[PDB]
Symmetry: C2
Subunit: 772 residues, 2 copies
């Protein structure tokens, strides 16, 4: 199919429209730039390899390069692998880039460089030097960068990459970079705002440094600035998950009342973790276009009840006041200033970590007439008491977030506390109004708890303490509910009328309610589904279900059932036929996950007991030691079969004689050592085949006919035991010449032998002696 | 060291005192009896193999045999592996056993035999034929068994091994077995008690059959009988986890009032799952020595409130009345008859599954003066209300079991519901008075909850809903408490005074309290240990701990810390030195488990931060990719190092130069491919070395010096990648001739190559061609 097999260990992609030739050698275990990169290459990515040096020979023929991504070939020791440490910093020889007349972007992050590389072409718009060892910026070193527009210099001096001195920037070092728009000096041990800066700047990142004072006029000329981040200067260090040294005398970052006067275009101001005790209104007197303000992790508890500065922010969209609580103070309630009611445009208000015992509707009245409010986040406040009915006045909201509180009758998990949330590396909301009570202490629910909440579309009760026999009465007011997350509670399914009052329920998650399923004698009614007439998806994963009082689950509507992490092996004990049709009467079911059910064999009758429209079946991670492939004929609509992570040793003699319809067959991580003589013969709408991580030694053409192999969208063969003898001549030739996508050819499709060929890639194999 | 290497694939043990030669071939994948079994063999075990037949040649020379254990060489299909099903039943040719003049015990269970084997020697005392296909007993087939004392014939006709007809026993089939003492016909589809049985019987097992009625004279001559089990005849089928057919019209097994009159020696009566509604006192009129009575899984709920039969049971030790509740009835309280107070000798009372809402002190008053009572089990009763102070009247008890209830302000997991709890296969009580409240709904505790319980030595609160900041006040009355199981709650360690009122506490289990450790911003005081002055063992596994407000844990008493399943990889993030001494001030710590902490590397400072008397350290299951063995020099008292299940690839050049104290080194399941030249040179304190499940190809003599191998109690080498070429001549010869204990030589110490030798045991390898 190809006359010239591709031997380059990089992925090569073509974008005709933009005339781009994309060569991606990410994580190919290279120790040298590979030979034979196409001369027309425009984008070359060499990230995460161990190439030790760059030189004029490196990109000699690649004169059309617009981008070189050469990140992390020598990452600082504390940031990189300790098993394969980089022995010596990257070496860049003179004139390696000067011939790259079209070069627009150069990423050299994470290479332990000591200086800004010189000789850079004047076409360059973007230079990235994060996580190097450059901590002195001099003007001579920047003249080469006359046309630069984006400059990343951060993470060159901080606790994961120390330089042991203060960062140094020469007076006016950046001022003649007349096109510079984005400057990032974060995580750098910087002590003063550099001046004077070019007035073209749109974004200035100065966060996580040692700046104790802003001068008057530090930002005097930046009338185009749109984003300013001064966070983490004078940090709030309590419970910090990184080594944290506060400014002396409990001092805040000191910002003169007029410091932002010039910033008329400012849209985002981030003052997270600056130990602020007051927010002077004067700050915002000539900023009228501000949309995003981050004041989290300061000491603004007393200020939130006053907050006169809010009157100057009628265009604010997002306000974050999280984690401003006074240490060791557990306030009785939340005191929001009336000034909040002047925030016409506010869509998102986050006030986590205010820390108070009781939320009362009257406390939220300053927010009552904010017409655009979409998210109210009061998580992580240790609230013990909240009458949920108070949110009848907030029907317009999209998300009411009370996650992680102590109530009883999506941001990253580390978000407010991590060092740099933007560090670069080498859900039910869509259903409508959402009330998030997850991770609270709700141990008993009753209908009155939800009075005036009929508008709710998604209720998250995950991770409460609900240990109750639901009888269909607990959720009466929730007439519109489409999504209920009940996971990680202690559901007791004594009554099959559980949940039946949620008449519009489409998704139900009762996963990780294993508690009552773990003790003998307790009754479980798994047929509670019959009464839910629009239920589309049911998740009951990790419930340890090993017994059921009812012998059939019933639904006219269910399409998806997740049943992972249960004990169907016990339910289907050989000789007990009573539960072999447990899923048979789920007549619209198309997807069934019964992985992780300890099913070491499938009793005969399982496949005949499947519902008729089953499309996606997972039997993964079952320790399956044998499989009667012929029984798949019962599954007349089957299109995806996931048998991964089992102990299978054979494939069917004729996949065409087992499942005529099957499109995706996943057999990775089994014990298959050979294929049947005619395995894929006539399997014409097979499209995806994963045989990776098995023990296959040889494959012959009869098992792998081309009538099927090139209608394959992907064929996975890596991590097997291929024997590269003269018997493998067809397989080797086909792999070398095929158009079919086979991942990891450059890295993990390898001969195990014989001898000379051990560890050699099949792509590089020369078997001419077989043809002498 | 040996002149004649052992090639027999069986373990051979010598007991000089008992004149026994024990040959154990259990599960050796044998398809024939091996040649060369010692002529002096007295005990030969061939269980779980695939030997298809027995013949006079089988034991031809083994005339001293006293026991043959030939179980499970052809298991019934539903009971056996479905990947290696037995193709044909065991074949026994005539006179295979008649020469075995000393044979006392013959186990032929699970071989699909169709008849009682004939030709057995008259020495035979024990014959076991369970899980065969023998379902008609004729007197002629039993004549060979004149001296038999123990006869196991059950599991020959039941749902896991059907015969599709009723069991048949000829009239008086057993009567001329004049020495018969133990007869078991369980799980056999038996329809009547066989009569007449020999009066020498001491134990009669008739359980799990289809006996609907006992005749008044069925047991008339059994004046020596000590154990009678009639359970599972007319079973109680509600929630049965096995196919269960009840007697018609809800009838119980029906037992005339005088059916037990002859059984004056009876000590054990088992009537579990007989659908009994009454226990007539007349049953026990001539039974005065009964010690154990099982009446579980009947319908005796109302009888328990009357129970006149108990007046005839003054010598009873154990009484089981569990799971007698009326279906769909949730009683208000438990009604124990006053007759219970006549149970003078009772030690154990189990009344699980009575099902009632409220336990009150007065309900237990019939038990108040049972002086010998040790165990009171009221688990699995859905009790909602119980004042724990009532157990001040029960200080003499060893265990008060309220496990699995619904209280709010050790038997196998399947026990009462499994089909045959005696089916054969092919904890804090020791601290003193124990109150087991595990798996209840306790969400809040206060000191008054434990008023008058100061005598308690162990409290099990595992698996409640306790989501509370303990401050040292919640357990004040528990002045004698030595063991607290607080696992699987939601401990909030805000205060370092948590648990300090438990002044005699020696063991604390706060494992699986990960809830509050999983959300950022929450304060956790890990230094709460300082206040527990006799605390010996702390378990805090599976807490997901990744942050700590305190930097050091402190204790003058702690000897064992389990810290498995946390995130020390995050706590010890490279460049953050603040927690590197977390354990340093546990000055008496001898055992530390920090397995499963995602430690892919160990930051420098970890080993210097360890406390000085550490002896047993586990770093297992960490994904460890590298290890600086020299740092072990800091651990001057280290004796056990568990590095199993990691990704290590090398051993130290000289282990002796890394640790002078190390005795036990566990390296199993790593990626080691070779040993260093002088690995064990002069490692004189080494006693135990596990290298199994690595990728080792070759071992040379320099690595394994003889003066070290001679002190090894065990050296594990199985499941490596041994290359059996002429380069391996020393290793192969040494393995064949050494006295060092090496497990699995017969099964899993194998050549992977070259070619011809693939899969061959190295013990069987002949390398003479290397020496021509
Ligand atoms: C190839 O390199 C060019 C040059 O850097 C990339 O072009 C940039 O793409 C981003 C994506 O929106 C734009 O925001 C930048 O403005 C572009 N810069 C220039 C100078 O054009 C291009 O994305 C790269 N393509 C691939 C597939 O890697
Ligand atoms: C940031 O700069 C400070 C100096 O401003 C560095 O601190 C010095 O470190 C040296 C060597 O570690 C000490 O001898 C000095 O006493 C320190 N000076 C002060 C004022 O503390 C610090 O190491 C730098 N931070 C990083 C992460 O490199
Ligand atoms: C070897 O076989 C003999 C005879 O079967 C075993 O001796 C019996 O051991 C049980 C176990 O306690 C005793 O109750 C019996 O009284 C013993 N004698 C008989 C005739 O059964 C002996 O235990 C076996 N040894 C081993 C190591 O398996
Ligand atoms: C126990 O014995 C009964 C008969 O006493 C067996 O039941 C018969 O089974 C055959 C074959 O399935 C049926 O055609 C008969 O109608 C059954 N008779 C009755 C009275 O039910 C039963 O199969 C046996 N049980 C086992 C496990 O072998
Ligand atoms: C059928 C009842 C008489 C006993 N019972 C059996 N299963 C259950 C169960 N899951 N929850 C319960 C909760 C309260 C009371 C009884 C039960 C119960
Ligand atoms: C110290 C408080 C100002 C805030 N706080 C910080 N960590 C915690 C914590 N684990 N549990 C709590 C329980 C109730 C109230 C506050 C907290 C709390
Ligand atoms: C709320 O806090 C503000 C700010 O100090 C204060 O002026 C006001 O009195 C407080 N109101 C209440 C009800 O606590
Ligand atoms: C909660 O507030 C609602 C008002 O919407 C009221 O009807 C209800 O009684 C309140 N519940 C409690 C427990 O105060
Ligand atoms: C509910 O909350 C839990 C825990 O906070 C979260 O993991 C889960 O994804 C949420 N459920 C939905 C449906 O968004
Ligand atoms: C579920 O099945 C059981 C049969 O075991 C029956 O008692 C119960 O009424 C059924 N419930 C529904 C809703 O069908
Ligand atoms: C307990 O039940 C028995 C059985 O009928 C009855 O005779 C007795 O009066 C009951 N006692 C109490 C206190 O309920
Ligand atoms: C529990 O019983 C004790 C008597 O031993 C009594 O002092 C206490 O008040 C009772 N507690 C409750 C809540 O009834
Ligand atoms: C406490 O009870 C739990 C749950 O039944 C059990 O797993 C655990 O072993 C018990 N703890 C002790 C110390 O006996
Ligand atoms: C500890 O908590 C209990 C109940 O929350 C309270 O009665 C007691 O005063 C507290 N003790 C201290 C020292 O705070
Ligand atoms: C635990 O550590 C915290 C801060 O690290 C300290 O305030 C507290 O007093 C300590 N408690 C004990 C018992 O050492
Ligand atoms: C390790 O070996 C070297 C060379 O024999 C020796 O100098 C050194 O002291 C040894 N270290 C230990 C801890 O035994």
């Amino acid at each position: 199919a190809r006359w010239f097999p591709k031997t380059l260990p990089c992925d090569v992609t073509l974008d005709v429209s933009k005339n781009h030739v994309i060569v991606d050698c990410t994580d190919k275990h290279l120790t040298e730039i590979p030979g034979g990169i196409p001369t027309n290459t425009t984008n070359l990515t060499l990230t995460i390899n161990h190439i030790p040096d760059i030189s004029p020979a490196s990109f000699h023929r690649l004169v059309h390069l617009v981008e070189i991504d050469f990140r992390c070939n020598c990452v600082p020791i504390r940031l990189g692998s300790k098993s394969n440490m980089c022995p010596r910093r990257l070496q860049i020889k003179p004139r390696s880039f000067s011939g790259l007349t079209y070069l627009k972007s150069l990423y050299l992050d994470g290479n332990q460089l000591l200086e800004i590389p010189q000789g850079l072409p004047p076409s360059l718009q973007l230079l990235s030097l994060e996580a190097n060892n450059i901590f002195s910026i001099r003007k001579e070193q920047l003249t080469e960068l006359a046309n630069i527009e984006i400059l990343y210099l951060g993470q060159n001096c901080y606790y994961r990459n120390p330089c042991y001195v203060s960062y140094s920037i020469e007076k006016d070092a950046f001022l003649n970079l007349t096109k510079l728009k984005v400057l990032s000096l974060k995580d750098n041990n910087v002590t003063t705002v550099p001046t004077v800066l070019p007035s073209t700047l749109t974004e200035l990142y100065l966060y996580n440094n040692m700046i104790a004072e802003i001068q008057e006029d530090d930002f005097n000329n930046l009338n185009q600035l749109q984003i300013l981040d001064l966070s983490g200067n004078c940090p709030r260090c309590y419970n910090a998950p990184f080594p944290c040294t506060p400014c002396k005398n409990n001092s805040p970052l000191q910002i003169p009342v007029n410091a932002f006067d010039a910033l008329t275009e400012l849209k985002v101001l981030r003052l997270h973790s600056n130990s602020l005790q007051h927010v002077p209104p004067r700050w915002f007197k000539n900023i009228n276009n501000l949309q995003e303000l981050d004041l989290s992790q300061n000491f603004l508890a007393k200020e939130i009840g006053d907050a006169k500065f809010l009157h100057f922010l009628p265009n604010l969209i997002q306000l974050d006041l999280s984690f401003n609580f006074e240490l060791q103070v557990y306030r009785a309630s939340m005191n929001l200033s009336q000034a909040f009611s002047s925030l016409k445009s506010l869509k998102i208000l986050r006030i986590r970590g205010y820390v108070f015992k009781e939320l009362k509707s009257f406390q939220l009245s300053p927010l009552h007439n904010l017409q655009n409010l979409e998210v109210l986040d009061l998580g992580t406040n240790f609230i013990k008491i909240a009458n949920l009915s108070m949110f009848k006045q907030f029907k317009r909201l999209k998300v009411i977030d009370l996650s992680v509180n102590k109530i009883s009758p999506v941001l990253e998990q580390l978000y407010y506390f991590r060092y740099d949330k933007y560090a670069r590396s080498c859900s039910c909301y869509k259903y409508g109004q959402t009330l998030d009570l997850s991770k609270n202490s709700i141990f008993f629910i009753k209908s009155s708890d939800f009075q005036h909440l009929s508008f709710l579309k998604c209720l998250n009760l995950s991770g409460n303490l609900i240990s109750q026999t639901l009888n269909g009465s607990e959720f009466q007011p929730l007439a519109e509910l489409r999504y209920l997350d009940f996971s990680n509670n202690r559901l007791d399914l004594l009554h099959s009328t559980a949940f039946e009052e949620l008449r519009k329920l489409e998704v139900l998650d009762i996963s990780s309610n294993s508690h009552y399923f773990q003790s003998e004698g307790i009754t479980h009614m798994l047929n509670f589904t019959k009464n839910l007439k629009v239920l589309q998806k049911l998740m009951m994963n990790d419930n340890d279900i090993s017994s059921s009082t009812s012998r059939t689950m019933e639904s006219e509507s269910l399409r998806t059932l997740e049943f992972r992490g249960n004990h169907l092996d016990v339910l289907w004990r050989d000789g007990d036929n009573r539960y072999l049709q447990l899923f048979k009467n789920l007549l619209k079911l198309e997807e069934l996950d019964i992985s992780k059910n300890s099913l070491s064999f499938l009793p005969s009758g399982v496949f005949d007991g499947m519902p008729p429209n089953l499309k996606n079946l997972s039997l993964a991670k079952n320790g399956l030691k044998s499989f009667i492939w012929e029984k798949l004929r019962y599954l007349k609509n089957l299109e995806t079969l996931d048998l991964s992570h089992n102990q299978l040793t054979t494939v069917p003699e004729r996949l065409s004689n087992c499942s005529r319809s099957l499109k995706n067959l996943i057999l990775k991580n089994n014990q298959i050592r050979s294929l049947t003589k005619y395995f894929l013969q006539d399997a014409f709408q097979l499209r995806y085949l994963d045989l990776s991580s098995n023990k296959i030694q040889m494959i012959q053409k009869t098992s792998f006919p081309e009538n099927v192999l090139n209608n394959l969208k992907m064929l996975l063969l890596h991590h097997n035991r291929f024997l590269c003898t003269c018997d493998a001549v067809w397989f080797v030739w086909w792999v070398q010449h095929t158009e079919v996508t086979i991942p990891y050819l450059a890295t993990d499709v390898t001969c195990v032998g014989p001898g000379a060929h051990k560890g050699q890639s099949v792509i590089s194999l020369d078997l001419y002696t077989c043809e002498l």
